[PDB]
Structure 1
Amino acid sequence: HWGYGKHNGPEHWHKDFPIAKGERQSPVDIDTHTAKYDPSLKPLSVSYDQATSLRILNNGHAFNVEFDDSQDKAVLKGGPLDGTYRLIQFHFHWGSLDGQGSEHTVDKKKYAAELHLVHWNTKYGDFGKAVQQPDGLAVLGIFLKVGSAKPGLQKVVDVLDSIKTKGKSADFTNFDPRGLLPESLDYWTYPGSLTTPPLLECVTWIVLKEPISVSSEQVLKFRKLNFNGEGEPEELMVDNWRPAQPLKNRQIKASF
Structure 2
Amino acid sequence: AHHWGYGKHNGPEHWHKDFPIAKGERQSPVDIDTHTAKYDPSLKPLSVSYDQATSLRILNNGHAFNVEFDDSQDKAVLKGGPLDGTYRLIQFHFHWGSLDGQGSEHTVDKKKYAAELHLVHWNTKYGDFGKAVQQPDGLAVLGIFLKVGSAKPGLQKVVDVLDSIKTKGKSADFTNFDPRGLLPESLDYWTYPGSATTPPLLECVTWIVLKEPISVSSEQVLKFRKLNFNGEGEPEELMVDNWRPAQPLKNRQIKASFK
Partner in structure 2 of residue 182 of structure 1: 184
Aligned positions of 1:107-118 closer than 5 A? 107-118=109-120
Aligned 8 A contact 2:45 2:187 in 1: no
CA distance in 1, matches of 2:210, 2:253: 16
Question: Aligned-pair distance for 1:39?
Answer: 1.1
Residue 132 (structure 1) shift: 0.5
Deviation of the 1:182 alpha carbon: 0.1
Task: Please list the CA deviations of residues 162-218 of structure 1 after superposition, one character each: whole Å capped at 9, or x if unmatched.
Answer: 000000000000000000000000000000000000000000000000000000000
Identity across the alignment (%):
100
TM-fit CA distance, 1:43: 1.7
CA-to-aligned-CA distance 1:76-114 (integer Å, 9 cap, x gap): 000000000000000000000000000000000000000
How far, CA to CA, are the matches of 2:132 and 2:171 in structure 1?
25
**How many pairs align?**
256
8 Å contact kept, 2:136–2:204: yes
Q: Cα offset for 1:6?
A: 1.6
Alignment match of 1:44 (pick from 35, 46, 64): 46
> 1:122 offset after TM fit, Å?
0.1
How far, CA to CA, are the matches of 1:6 and 1:248 in structure 2? 27
| Correspondence 1:89-238 to 2 at 5 A | 89-238=91-240
| Aligned mates of 2:45, 2:162 — CA distance in 1 | 35
Spell out, residue by residue over 1:39-67, the C-alpha distance to the aligned partner (whole angstroms, 9 max, x if none).
11122100000000000000000000000
CA distance in 1: counterparts of 2:8 and 2:235, whole angstroms: 16
Structure 2: runs of 5+ lacking an equivalent: none
Pairing of 1:9-28 with structure 2 (within 5 A): 9-28=11-30
* 1:20 CA displacement: 0.1
After the TM superposition, which segments of 4 or more aligned residues of structure 1 sit over 6 Å from their partners? none
TM-score (norm 1): 1.00
Question: 1-side partners of 2:209 and 2:28: how far apart?
Answer: 12
Runs of at least 5 residues in structure 1 that lack an aligned partner in the other structure:
none
User: Alpha-carbon deviations, 1:11-37, whole Å to 9, x = none?
Assistant: 000000000000000000000000000
Q: Distance in 2 between matches of 1:176 and 1:159?
A: 15
Deviation at 1:143, TM superposition (A): 0.1
Aligned counterparts of 1:236 and 1:43: Cα–Cα separation in 2: 39
